[PDB]
């Protein structure tokens, strides 16, 4: 609200919290990112390194649809199964009856391997996968299949 603003506490003080000799002006240092190379150079090379210059090629007509690759680590892999049926799959590890976790329809493109899934069979449906993500799945007895 306005009543808690320090302006209400600054009534009566001539400079309104801006200094007698500073004389708060409109734009004493410039407008926006002005003087990024001349008189604010120390700021722009200390607090914001790397602002000025080229880097990398220019991607023409970039679409974030192509680069939609949300990552699903193996720890979260068991969140895909609804919590009601997680237990009946966590217990009774069955090779011929393994839950079919479909990561894609939940919106996950790539399976990473942050690891430590319990050693029970599991079915993983993902467009991509990392090398170590497989090995933990196989070390748990699961299999990875390719879908797109």
């Amino acid at each position: 609200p306005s009543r808690f603003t320090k302006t209400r506490k600054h009534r009566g003080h001539v400079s309104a919290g801006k200094g007698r000799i500073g004389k708060h002006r409109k734009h004493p240092g410039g407008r926006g990112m002005a003087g990024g190379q001349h008189h604010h150079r120390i700021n722009m090379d200390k607090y914001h390194p790397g602002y000025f210059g080229k880097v990398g090629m220019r991607y023409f007509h970039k679409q974030q649809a192509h680069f939609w690759k949300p990552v699903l680590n193996l720890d979260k892999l068991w969140t895909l199964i609804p919590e009601d049926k997680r237990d009946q799959y966590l217990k009774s590890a069955s090779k011929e009856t393994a839950p079919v976790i479909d990561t894609l329809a939940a919106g996950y493109g790539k399976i990473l391997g942050k690891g430590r899934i319990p050693n029970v069979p599991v079915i993983v449906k993902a467009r991509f996968v990392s090398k170590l993500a497989e090995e933990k799945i196989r070390a748990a007895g699961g299999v990875v299949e390719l879908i797109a």
């Binding site: 390194p49 790397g50 602002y51 000025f52 210059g53 080229k54 880097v55 979260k76 430590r116």
Partner: protein, 185 residues
Amino acid sequence: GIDHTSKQHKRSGHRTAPKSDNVYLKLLVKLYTFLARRTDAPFNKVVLKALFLSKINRPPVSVSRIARALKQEGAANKTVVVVGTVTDDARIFEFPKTTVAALRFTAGARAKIVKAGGECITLDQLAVRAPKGQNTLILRGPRNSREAVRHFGMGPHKGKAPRILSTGRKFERARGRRRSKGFKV
């Protein structure tokens, strides 16, 4: 007229009362203020000064971290006290039976703990069951893990995270960060 070596009328700089308005969170402080004062147990003094911490200083403690605390030998039967919230975790799939006293439990944490055979209580049950912190164990959530801390202490050659909205190419990856253009940090 005396010289003053230190700054006079210097406030102690520590929170003395929770400057939250919460009445229930002041009832707990009222209880523990009495316990901390009327007991010699250092545990009550600790929990009293942990109830005042702000939200950033009361980080969530995962039930995975609760389990890691119980992995210590001699702590299997100890109760766990978390002055703050207790959020659950999908990372752990086996949870040992235990009792946890925390300000707030997420619904996910209660379901995970109680189903695991444990039990969830608050600080007042903890006071009833153990006034002076018998066989207790205080856990604190990680504090530098906050995203606001990656940018703290920013400077050249510090390995910190610049304050920036959009992260990617064309944003702080030019002269001043790479050695090819200009210089390196």
